[PDB]
């Protein structure tokens, strides 16, 4: 599925040794499916895969 | 989790607080006085009639 028309919104976060950050994304799809997510930069780590 | 504040002293008026615990839905609490019974320390001297 081609991914376009993205919008990422940060809800709430706080820096601690556990996962203390949550953000939301709005999106316009091409078709249903599953594909991964990743952060190439090292400033933050993504709990989800 | 715990919460601290200051409440004005009055017998009838209730007090409504809304605790926040990040990463969780907020909860509100309601506390209301019923009495304030000052008690002194006393000793007898004598009686009369």
Curated annotation (Swiss-Prot), chain A:
Quaternary structure (record): The precursor of protein E3/E2 and E1 form a heterodimer shortly after synthesis. Processing of the precursor of protein E3/E2 into E2 and E3 results in a heterodimer of the spike glycoproteins E2 and E1. Spike at virion surface are constituted of three E2-E1 heterodimers. After target cell attachment and endocytosis, E1 change conformation to form homotrimers. E2-E1 heterodimers interact with host VLDLR or LRP8/APOER2 to mediate viral entry. Interacts with 6K protein.
Maturation and modification: N-glycosylated.
Protein name, as recorded: Spike glycoprotein E1
Membrane topology: Single-pass type I membrane protein
Organism in which the protein naturally occurs: Eastern equine encephalitis virus (EEEV)
Locations listed in the record: Virion membrane; Host cell membrane
Biological classification of the source: Viruses, Riboviria, Orthornavirae, Kitrinoviricota, Alsuviricetes
Domain of life: Viruses
Functional summary from the UniProt entry: Class II viral fusion protein. Fusion activity is inactive as long as E1 is bound to E2 in mature virion. After virus attachment to target cell via host VLDLR or LRP8/APOER2 and endocytosis, acidification of the endosome induces dissociation of E1/E2 heterodimer and concomitant trimerization of the E1 subunits. This E1 trimer is fusion active, and promotes release of viral nucleocapsid in cytoplasm after endosome and viral membrane fusion. Efficient fusion requires the presence of cholesterol and sphingolipid in the target membrane.
